């Protein structure tokens, strides 16, 4: 009896049971509207019945006892997107993010509503960068080979305030090899490893002693082999002192606030030696296009022992700057 007759907003994100004791069944079934179309599929074992199919919003359905009831009529709708892509193979610090077109009043919701799956299993958990986005990850970088099956059921679910899931997404992604690239200002030389081991030197020039590269974990973003750094997208204005309009090619972005990897070709003289740029990792043409060949998404960069601060963990491509106990209590509820 997991409903009762003549009730009125039925969720549907939950399947309508029916459960015997002492006893048998049946005979049960359920119908329609639309339409009229008929129920789900039925269910074994010995004493409960359950929906197969996933039930419409604004319906009426008939369900020994007779129960007529009906779904959620929802106020608003919102519906969530998922990276990273179906099928993809990503770094080891790629995070799961879900993001709805919507601000999310109940966060705890729509946490419960993702369900996330690793093979071999591994610890996540969830933390928000603003009211529409949502990550997760282990504590560690990922275990390369790892495979991770996200379900986002947030149809039929209430997310607060009248809000409701549009839909149910999924993706199942694959993460690769351990690739961290170390830009180390004591030697102002970048290092590729790959499972711990050097592929790869090139000779960088950071930000400048006012305008420093932070330090701390970053994580790969988009790649463009060619692109406009315009500072007024971050914030500051072309025409002011820390201003710039800049051409680039093979830019590989580590930063929603603006750091790339890419090539400088004004700056290879000071690439080893001197700080000149505005916070972006230069390097030569090629050692440019070697990284915007051969790093992938989700892989890592860190910087260390720049005269900076800390990159902040809630920057978009941050997420491994926040420890772990913080990240793990989460921001969904107090
Ligand atoms: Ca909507």
Redesign the pocket.
């Known amino acids: 009896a997991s409903v009762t007759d003549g009730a009125v907003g039925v969720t549907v994100d939950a399947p309508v049971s029916v459960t015997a004791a002492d006893g048998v069944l049946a005979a049960v079934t359920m119908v329609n509207d639309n339409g009229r179309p008929v129920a789900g599929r039925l269910s074994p074992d010995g004493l409960r019945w359950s929906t197969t199919e996933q039930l419409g919003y604004n319906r009426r359905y008939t369900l020994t006892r007779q129960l007529t009831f009906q779904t959620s009529s929802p106020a ?4 969530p997107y998922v990276m990273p892509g179906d099928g993809e193979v990503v770094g080891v610090g790629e995070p799961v993010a879900i993001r709805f ?2 601000n999310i009043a109940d966060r705890g919701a729509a946490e419960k509503a993702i369900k996330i799956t690793t093979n071999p299993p591994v610890e996540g958990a969830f933390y928000w960068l603003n009211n529409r986005e949502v990550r997760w990850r282990p504590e560690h970088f990922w275990k390369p080979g790892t495979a991770v099956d996200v379900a986002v059921n947030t149809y039929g679910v209430d997310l607060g305030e009248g809000m409701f899931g ?1 839909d149910n997404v999924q993706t199942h992604f694959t993460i690769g090899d351990e690739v961290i690239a170390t830009a180390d200002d004591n030697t102002k030389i970048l290092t590729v490893r790959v499972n711990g081991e050097v592929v790869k030197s090139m000779p960088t020039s950071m930000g400048k002693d006012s305008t420093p590269t932070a330090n701390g974990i970053y994580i790969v973003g988009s790649r463009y082999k060619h692109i406009i750094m315009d500072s007024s997208t971050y914030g500051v204005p072309v025409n002011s002192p820390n201003g710039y309009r800049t051409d680039v090619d093979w830019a590989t972005q580590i930063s929603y606030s603006g750091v790339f990897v890419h090539s400088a070709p004004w700056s290879v003289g000071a690439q080893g030696h001197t700080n000149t740029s505005h916070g972006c990792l230069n390097v030569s043409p090629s050692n440019a296009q070697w990284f915007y060949d051969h790093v992938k998404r989700g892989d890592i960069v860190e910087v260390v022992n720049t005269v900076g601060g800390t990159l902040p963990g809630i920057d978009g491509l941050g997420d491994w700057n926040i420890p772990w106990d913080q990240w793990r209590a989460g921001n969904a509820k107090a």
Do not use: G, Y
């Not at 608003?76 to 519906?79: A, F, I, Q, S």
């Open positions: 608003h709708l919102t519906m077109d919507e549009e």
